[PDB]
Amino acid sequence: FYMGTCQDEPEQLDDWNRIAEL
Amino acid sequence: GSASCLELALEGERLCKSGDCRAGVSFFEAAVQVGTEDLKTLSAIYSQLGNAYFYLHDYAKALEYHHHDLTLARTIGDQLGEAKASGNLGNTLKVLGNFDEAIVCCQRHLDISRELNDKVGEARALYNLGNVYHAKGKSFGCPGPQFPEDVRNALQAAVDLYEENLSLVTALGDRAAQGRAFGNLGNTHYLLGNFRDAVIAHEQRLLIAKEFGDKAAERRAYSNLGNAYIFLGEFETASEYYKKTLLLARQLKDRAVEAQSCYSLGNTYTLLQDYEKAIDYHLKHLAIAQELKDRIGEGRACWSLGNAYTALGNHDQAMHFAEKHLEI
């Protein structure tokens, strides 16, 4: 039976400090 | 000039981080419009634009910006930047369904990270590469488990990559990254028909979700666990997890997930013969789909209701939803 969207891990972006660390 | 470009870029980055990518994006664009001679800075601006556009679901634009970042990282000889740009391109190509090129790009990220002995980069690259194979295998035909050898080959390659990622993030002490790998591994095992293995991985994901107070991750894990138990023939256990997803869906005021919980609960009770419990959960789903304007789910509610009443005896209400099913 239909179960919806599998519920995978959302995409992950750990990199919002790059410019500030430059 | 170079100084105010940097100043605008910093503000763009602050806004994206705080959950305002719409506003941050246009600070990045202004930064590019002002421009700078520091190509390391410019490269990072392009990459952050690609990231912002990715999060805004503009994958075409994201791809173009990552490509500029990649090329620029090459012209200046920045290997670390080249590796990160290749990873970002791969993740974008994956969403766009360019799996073949996604593999190449993510493999580059991995190869360069190993060449440089960057363990954090290496772990990320393994996770990303696993994700590409996962998405590739998942893209075939009907969703869920069961067909072409390449499906199984891709999913098995994702398992191996997630297991290697997990080994590495354990050594790094990265709990959040472990949760992510456990989650995706569990769904990869699920698609392979390895249901007991899916359960083990989803339980670990659940534990880590609770540790971080990550309610969205907790909900996913319960839902995924329910799914796995359905396929194990353990329907009582499934209803338990489906019920726990339902609680959190209500607490997090997420109506769409709230609706799905009800539908899968209705079906679990159908498989457990409790037809009256089935109806209750189906009408709560039916109502929610009427609320969210989801016509596709509204149709499914009607058909399921008709089947349950038929095993109960109620011929009159079975006909009532059949006529409502025809209308949609």
Tell if the CB–CB gap between B263 and A15 is shorter than 8 Å. no
- Whether the CB-CB separation of B268 and B239 falls below 8 Å is answered with yes
Residue B14 burial (C-beta neighbours within 10 Å; 0-12, 13-18, 19+): middle
Number of CB atoms found within 10 A of residue B79's CB: 14
B249 by DSSP, 3-state: which? Answer: helix
Which residues, other chains included, contact B26 with Cβ-Cβ below 8 Å and sequence gap of 6+?
B12
Residues of A in contact with B227 (CB under 8 A): 3, 6
Indicate the residue type of B187. N
Sign of CA dihedral B227, B228, B229, B232: positive
Q: What is the CATH number of the domain that holds B272?
A: 1.25.40.10
Residue of A1, A14, A18 with shortest CB distance to B267: A1
- CA-to-CA distance for B34 and B42, rounded, in angstroms? 11
How far is CA B274 from each of CA B43, B185, B188, B277, B285, rounded to the nearest angstrom? 60, 33, 31, 6, 17
Question: How far does B199 lie from chain A, in Å, by closest CA?
Answer: 14
- Whether the CB-CB separation of B113 and B125 falls below 8 Å is answered with yes
The answer, for B249 touching chain A at a CB cutoff of 8 Å, is: no
Q: What's the DSSP call for residue B143?
A: S
- CA-to-CA distance for B292 and B268, rounded, in angstroms? 23
Alpha-carbon dihedral B176, B164, B112, B25, rounded to 10 degrees: -30
Residue B273 burial (C-beta neighbours within 10 Å; 0-12, 13-18, 19+): exposed
Residue of B9, B224, B263 with shortest CB distance to A19: B9
- CA-to-CA distance for A22 and A17, rounded, in angstroms? 9
Residue B67 burial (C-beta neighbours within 10 Å; 0-12, 13-18, 19+): middle
Helix residue ranges per DSSP H, B18-118: 21-34, 39-55, 59-76, 79-95, 99-115
Method: X-ray
Resolution in A: 2.3
Number of domains, chain B: 1
Residues of B in contact with A18 (CB under 8 A): 13, 44, 47-48
The answer, for B44 touching chain A at a CB cutoff of 8 Å, is: yes
Question: How far does B220 lie from chain A, in Å, by closest CA?
Answer: 6
**Joined tokens for residue B274:** 């409790």
Q: Residues B75, B28, B99, CA angle at the centre, nearest 5°?
A: 60
Tell if the CB–CB gap between A19 and B48 is shorter than 8 Å. yes
Range of the domain at B3: 1-328
